[PDB]
């Protein structure tokens, strides 16, 4: 059967004492006036987001529950039984029999690996709330000496169990009622002796929304701006380029010999799928530091001008490959712009570059007249003159050869051991993109609210055929606010206009909570032919 839950299932959301206050709480609650399933004395009811369980009886007919996923031995299931002496809780691989129900041995046949066990201590109403969040199974409860009653009573915490399992179904171990929880905002009124004596379900109806807006249980006559209606996206789409070839990262990172830092090597990366997961297989403990991005997000973006600069330095100079750093390497060899967007991947290459004898394949410029500008290369060997003399000639006194060799050896300490460095420079300045992460493209949905992703530009709105024409070098259009209002579809290359989803202001006309609970609703700046009416909770 089915019955009305009324205003039941409120539970103390925290462990803090409060008095003479109206507190707002966002949590998994039982919506007011909900349709609860009534069973009489039973089946395996699902676990949606948490359950409110009530039991009107006077004979302890209800003894426990069995939460789990398959409720068989192939998975792990939670077990809770209330034996007259104690309460037993056991998360453990249970081959539950088909009709569990005093001989406790008629519930499950086998109890394989048990990762958690626990033991503890006029009809009556035993209300319970079960939740499963972050591996914790939380239980709140309340007993009341008593169709569910129509009074207010709040449930107190009982136990949080670190059971570490998914719970999708449960069953009552044998009148019991089963309601379900949803994420809701509630306005709870605490008493002077700290008792929750009333609540408002903010999402129940317009009057409740007015009550929560004003933070009061009584509303005076008037018209109140309560919230804004917003059409929710029906579906999501992804539109990335059709390219499928993988980027030539192996020939960069897995190169037999790297360049010298003074003559550092630059490689252009284009027309490819850049899967950065292939990284993380370099000389372990490697440094992967990004500027303007996070390493974990690179796989989800699209890049315009991707360049891989590779060279070898000594370990203690890896700190110098960063914006604004100073030193021989950062001043005469390889400078990064202060506004660098990209990533520096450095890793010890002792077992590739060090030579017992002294490796002279890797040089660095130690003396330069002026510093270098960003991403500039100097491969000249003229003699540096630190003296006023006409040094023009050969080296000598105050006349130094500018390049010096690292002479990497296997016996050096880490600080002077070779490190292979790769700098990935890319412009996330949207623009037409050629390198993109591994991402699947859906179909293009027009004239409909959707979540969209165009080459990494994410948004929500309505896409329509645009009359604007982009120049070949343009991929997005921008408005006065500098928000993207037009986009060229990466695959078909058509121009789409982006418009926000339908939304507007809502006002509630109330004669006064004292006079009545009837309300009228004004959808501001909207005509009725356009007032949202979507049945399911999608609008």
């Amino acid at each position, epitope marked *: 059967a089915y019955t009305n839950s009324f205003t039941r299932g409120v539970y103390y959301p925290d462990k803090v004492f409060r008095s003479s206050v109206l507190h707002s709480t966002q949590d998994l609650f039982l919506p007011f006036f909900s349709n609860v399933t009534w069973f009489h004395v039973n089946p395996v009811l699902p676990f949606n987001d948490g359950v409110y369980f009530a039991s009107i009886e006077k004979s302890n007919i209800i003894r426990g529950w069995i939460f789990g996923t398959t409720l068989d031995s192939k998975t792990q299931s939670l077990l809770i039984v209330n034996n007259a002496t104690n309460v037993v809780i056991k998360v453990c691989e249970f081959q539950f029999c088909n009709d569990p129900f005093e001989s406790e041995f008629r519930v499950y046949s086998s109890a394989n690996n048990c990762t958690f066990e626990y033991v503890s201590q006029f009809k009556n109403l035993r209300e319970f709330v079960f939740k499963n969040i972050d591996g914790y199974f939380k239980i709140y409860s309340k007993h009341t000496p008593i169709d569910l009653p129509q009074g207010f009573s709040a449930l107190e915490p009982l136990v949080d169990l670190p059971i570490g399992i998914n719970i999708t179904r449960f069953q009552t171990l044998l009148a019991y009622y089963v309601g379900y929880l949803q994420p809701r905002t509630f306005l709870l009124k605490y008493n002077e002796n700290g008792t929750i004596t009333d609540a408002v379900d903010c999402a129940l109806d317009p009057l409740s929304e007015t009550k929560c807006t004003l933070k009061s249980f009584t509303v005076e006559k008037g018209i109140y701006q309560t919230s804004n209606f917003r059409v929710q996206p029906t579906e999501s789409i992804v539109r990335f380029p059709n390219i499928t070839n993988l980027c030539p990262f192996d020939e960069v990172f897995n190169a*037999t*010999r790297f360049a010298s830092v003074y003559a550092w090597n630059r490689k252009r990366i284009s027309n490819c799928v850049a899967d950065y997961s292939v990284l993380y297989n370099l000389a372990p403990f490697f440094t992967f530091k990004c500027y303007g991005v996070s390493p974990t997000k690179l796989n989800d973006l699209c890049f315009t001008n991707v360049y891989a600069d590779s060279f070898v330095i000594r370990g203690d100079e890896v700190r110098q490959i960063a914006p604004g750093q100073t030193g021989n390497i950062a001043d005469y060899n390889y400078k990064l712009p202060d506004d660098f967007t990209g990533c520096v991947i450095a890793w010890n290459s*002792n*077992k*590739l570059d*060090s*030579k*017992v*004898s002294g*490796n*002279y*394949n890797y040089l660095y410029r130690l003396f330069r007249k002026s510093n270098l500008k960003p991403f500039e290369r100097d491969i000249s060997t003229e003699i540096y003159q630190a003296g006023n003399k006409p040094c023009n000639g050969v080296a000598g006194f105050n006349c130094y050869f500018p390049l010096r060799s690292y002479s990497f050896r*296997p016996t050096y300490g880490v600080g002077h051991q070779p490190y292979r460095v790769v700098v990935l420079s890319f412009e996330l300045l949207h623009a037409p993109a050629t390198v993109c992460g591994p991402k699947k493209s859906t179909n293009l949905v027009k004239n409909k609210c959707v979540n969209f992703n165009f080459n990494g530009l994410k948004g929500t709105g309505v896409l329509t055929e645009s009359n604007k024409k982009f120049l070949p070098f343009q991929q997005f259009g921008r408005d006065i606010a500098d928000t993207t209002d037009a986009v060229r579809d990466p695959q078909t290359l058509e121009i789409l206009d982006i418009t926000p989803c339908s939304f507007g202001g809502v006002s509630v006309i109330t004669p006064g909570t004292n006079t009545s609970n009837q309300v009228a609703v004004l959808y501001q700046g909207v005509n009725c032919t356009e007032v949202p009416v979507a049945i399911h909770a999608d609008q």
Partner: antibody
Amino acid sequence: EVQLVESGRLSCAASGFTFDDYAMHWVRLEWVSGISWNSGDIGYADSVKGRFTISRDNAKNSLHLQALYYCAKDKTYDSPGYFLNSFDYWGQGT
Amino acid sequence: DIQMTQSPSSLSASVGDRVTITCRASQGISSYLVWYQQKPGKAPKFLIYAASTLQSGVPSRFSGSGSGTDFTLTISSLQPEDFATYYCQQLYSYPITFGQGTRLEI
């Protein structure tokens, strides 16, 4: 794939790999001589100094050199000391 | 340096006979020594480098370890394809020197 034919002085003709990235050695096993990718580390044997000279023509992928002689390719780009220094591909003979 | 001294002059065994091989040297050469394999008539192959990271696609059974001149080749299931004159090759310094040949028998 790698092919190392000991054509022929001796003139090995490399194929199947990037000749410019690896060191090359003659061995007759009585190793004869070695040479690096840029010919910056040319190392001979105790019995050859002044007689045989090793060299390489990277443009044509040739190992030239003024028991049978082999044509091993080094697993790395430079002279003996390296954790990865070895002769991982040979030819046939001469 | 240096003088590789394969110290069996030769060895012999049968299918399933795990056999060990060794060779010595003048000075220390750390791990910069490899072991090749010359099957009769054929040219030498590669088995392992530094005695740890076995060459890819090579039967792991051929293996060994040791520093300086201590080098101990070690198989587990010596088989028809494991009969050949193996060499120890020092690579620490140049002139590079080879061994003389632990020609295995049938």
